[PDB]
Amino acid sequence: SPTGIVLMNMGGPSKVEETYDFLYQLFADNDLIPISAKYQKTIAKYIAKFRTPKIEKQYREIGGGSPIRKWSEYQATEVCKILDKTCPETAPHKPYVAFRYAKPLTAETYKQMLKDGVKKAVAFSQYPHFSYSTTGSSINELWRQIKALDSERSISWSVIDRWPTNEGLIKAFSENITKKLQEFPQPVRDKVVLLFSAHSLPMDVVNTGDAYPAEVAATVYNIMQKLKFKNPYRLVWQSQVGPKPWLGAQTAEIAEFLGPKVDGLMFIPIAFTSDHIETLHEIDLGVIGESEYKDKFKRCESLNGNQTFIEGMADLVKSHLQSNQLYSNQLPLDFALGKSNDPVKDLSLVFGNHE
Amino acid sequence: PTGIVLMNMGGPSKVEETYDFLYQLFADNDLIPISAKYQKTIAKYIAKFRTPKIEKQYREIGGGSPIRKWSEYQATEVCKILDKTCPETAPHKPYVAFRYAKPLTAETYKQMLKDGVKKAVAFSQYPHFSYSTTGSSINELWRQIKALDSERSISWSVIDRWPTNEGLIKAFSENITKKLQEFPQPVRDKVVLLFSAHSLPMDVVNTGDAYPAEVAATVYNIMQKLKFKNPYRLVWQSQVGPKPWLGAQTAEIAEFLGPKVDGLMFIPIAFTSDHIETLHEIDLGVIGESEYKDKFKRCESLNGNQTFIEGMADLVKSHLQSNQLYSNQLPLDFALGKSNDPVKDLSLVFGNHE
Ligand SMILES: [Co+2]
Ligand SMILES: [Co+2]
């Protein structure tokens, strides 16, 4: 009986047409978005069609589609082959990806899992940095899908809610960064500023006591220790949108500011593990693309298929499996500080064997 | 002939050095950007207005700030070590230069010239760099070097950060561990460890200030040493005025959690000694004013901790034993900081220039 290793993460439209459904899924979540209730399957779509055009154009601009799913199913498949020679008592490990908004959503995957006769499953969240708005929404969803497609639970779930300083992760980022630094002049290679750029969070989420901001920061300091603080660095945030206040030190804003007085700037996808709208469009076409400093701005390659990084994940899942912990010591606290309309009341009820 | 000048904001030594302190404090546009054009003016207005309450706080904790004493004690103690550890740099005289508190950089730079100091190290007692603090502190030293020592007698070098100094981490660790012993065993691994650090105006945060992330580095390191035994969270205290400030307020997080936890510990993660903030904000306010005074406890401040002091002495050793009159991060710090009177060339401020 196969052990399910399910990679999770918010998701992105495989191909341009997928935008509508992707945007619909998004705009129908109270984990954050409305209030309402069925006066909002309505209001939801009144927002989806509105927004579809813009987004399709962005994806069209990046080859047409988010590479997330491609890369995810890949990472998931490699980490399972390794887990096969590595963790034999959990013998067959099958690759599964369950995205929060993109396809396959949690329910679709859950269905496929059961019809594959899955006993044990590991909700392996692809966000090394836990945020109730990311790794949290997947859990609150997983809960519902469990209750929906599997009451009297045939599946026993455990979850890897965070891995900010996993060795593979840190080594992978270094290397990729030195590798990218090397393609800089030299008489100025040590003066290139490393801008670690993570997706930002709204202040009324940060102030909530979210664990995201500080964890990202731990990863950053770890990579710098590895590189023996050779270059100047700084943790900045991107992707903020709307009128509300967002976690400060905006990537674009600081890029343009330093653009003149610096002779080198490197952006690093610190908070995500593959390319997606954020790197390909926001940074490559935005921050770098439209800047008059295009030349002294380069982006560190996303982890993607990086082997060292894959092995890191395998190491992770293996440690998680053999530790018998259903979730990190931090999750209960997160859930007590998080904010949702349909939360998880007891984490110990969601995860574990409930025969 | 070698001065080790510890530096931090400082605190009123006597219940009334307050208005002077608060004035000096808010007159600094580098700490809290209130008015680029009328900070000083708006300053004494705020000073004279907040002096009552604050003066009463300094009296609910003994009538003064212990910062000066603790600073001086650490300074000399760290210096006693350096004499046996770095004979290579003859006598090490302990100095203290407060930004807004009594021994101001002014007073202190004078002494050092009278005592004939050739070389000195500006030792920021703020493990985590921020422009509002270390920067302000430095931007002043520059002004002092310019008015008091145009000859360029003293050779300065700065310790602008030390987020993960071994002694620091280990100290905080031991101190957190023993305090958890005060909680009943059956709950010990359940106590949430709130690392409370002085908040920052969002205005400073969005400039690219290195502080928030550096505090984060210390906290994490501390949790590894503790093998993530308990739940933890980095929260923020201290703020003022309508202006928005960082993270989750310690006060609020505390009040919200009281009902959901077995216990809460507060850790002065961002400072090196007790002062108004631990002794009052936390002890009297957060802890002693909560109907949970029992399930709430405060981790001991480093103060005169030997593990801590030895790390500082050992830190100074490393520093001296090298070039770098400042770290690799400072320049960027100065590119991102915001001041009406910044240091144009860090390269000119720290060196031999004679
Ligand atoms: Co976004
Ligand atoms: Co303060």
Curated annotation (Swiss-Prot), chain A:
Pathway where this protein functions: Porphyrin-containing compound metabolism; protoheme biosynthesis; protoheme from protoporphyrin-IX: step 1/1
CDD domains: Ferrochelatase_C, Ferrochelatase_N
Entry's Gene Ontology cellular component terms: mitochondrial inner membrane; mitochondrion
Keyword set, alphabetical order: Heme biosynthesis, Iron, Lyase, Membrane, Mitochondrion, Mitochondrion inner membrane, Porphyrin biosynthesis, Transit peptide
One of the GO biological process terms: heme biosynthetic process
EC number: 4.98.1.1
Active site: 315
Broad class of enzyme this protein falls into: lyase
Bilayer topology: Peripheral membrane protein
Annotated GO MF terms: ferrochelatase activity
Top-level lineage group: Eukaryota
UniProt-annotated location(s): Mitochondrion inner membrane
Name of one Pfam family that matches: Ferrochelatase
Catalytic reaction equation(s): heme b + 2 H(+) = protoporphyrin IX + Fe(2+)
Biological role stated in the UniProt entry: Catalyzes the ferrous insertion into protoporphyrin IX.
Family statement: Belongs to the ferrochelatase family.
Other facts noted in the record for this chain: Ferrochelatase interacts with protoprophyrinogen oxidase, and associates with complex 1 of the respiratory chain.
UniProt protein name: Ferrochelatase, mitochondrial
Organism: Saccharomyces cerevisiae (strain ATCC 204508 / S288c)
Gene behind the chain: HEM15
